Design a protein around this ligand. Sequence first.
Ligand SMILES: CCOc1ccc2nc(S(N)(=O)=O)sc2c1
Ligand SMILES: [Zn+2]
Length: 257
Amino acid sequence: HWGYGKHNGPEHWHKDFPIAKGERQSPVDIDTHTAKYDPSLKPLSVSYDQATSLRILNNGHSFQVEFDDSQDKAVLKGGPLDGTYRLIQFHFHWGSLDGQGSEHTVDKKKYAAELHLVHWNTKYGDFGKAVQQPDGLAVLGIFLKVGSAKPGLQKVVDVLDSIKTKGKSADFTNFDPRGLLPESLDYWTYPGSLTTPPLLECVTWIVLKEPISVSSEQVLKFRKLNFNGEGEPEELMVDNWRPAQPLKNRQIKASFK
Ligand SMILES: CCOc1ccc2nc(S(N)(=O)=O)sc2c1
Ligand SMILES: [Zn+2]
């Protein structure tokens, strides 16, 4: 099975998922001086006022908060997108130390963690159909830096003990993902891929310029999760991030000057 360990980590993924060496892989380093400002880009439109969270799950390589996506409750529109994208889940990537953890980097700077809000294009009817299409997903990426606490993240931090090992889930209702957004919605965008297997090249990435702050205590609680299932040898869930991949024939666009 693939993972983030020495014997099954990202450098090995291509043997089972040859698209790992593809032309539009993620994540990438965002070179701020080379990104192109595009005044054609629209502001993002984040519509999360009716979101309905359902569950939180330790999937063995991250934890994810899942949402009801059977109706246009929580949607993303605008920016570089065409059409309406529904929120299905968010999850994080983080490090063993505060100096690493994010997937995207900015001028080679790593952040302590990265939040992915994953949305699928409703014109494809369901998420499994959307990931086979080059415009099927839109992922909102938010960097986390260590500093002050993020009050809106604490309900998540508080339930992690319940889902410590792989395959455990818990009811997680009435969570409002608006409390995870930064103040500004300025962004970079490029065409890319899922950053875990199957690494499909179906994602429009929208990476926010402004990080959110979280406290050292909040991130430390992430690092107490386990990659293993209950009853198995304890392996702490840390450094579940992929390297920056080559940009190849892609242009990163910025919504801001
Ligand atoms: C297709 C089975 O579900 C998947 C698989 C990988 C995957 N990676 C991301 S990420 N890290 O946001 O690029 S969301 C996601 C959903
Ligand atoms: Zn992710």
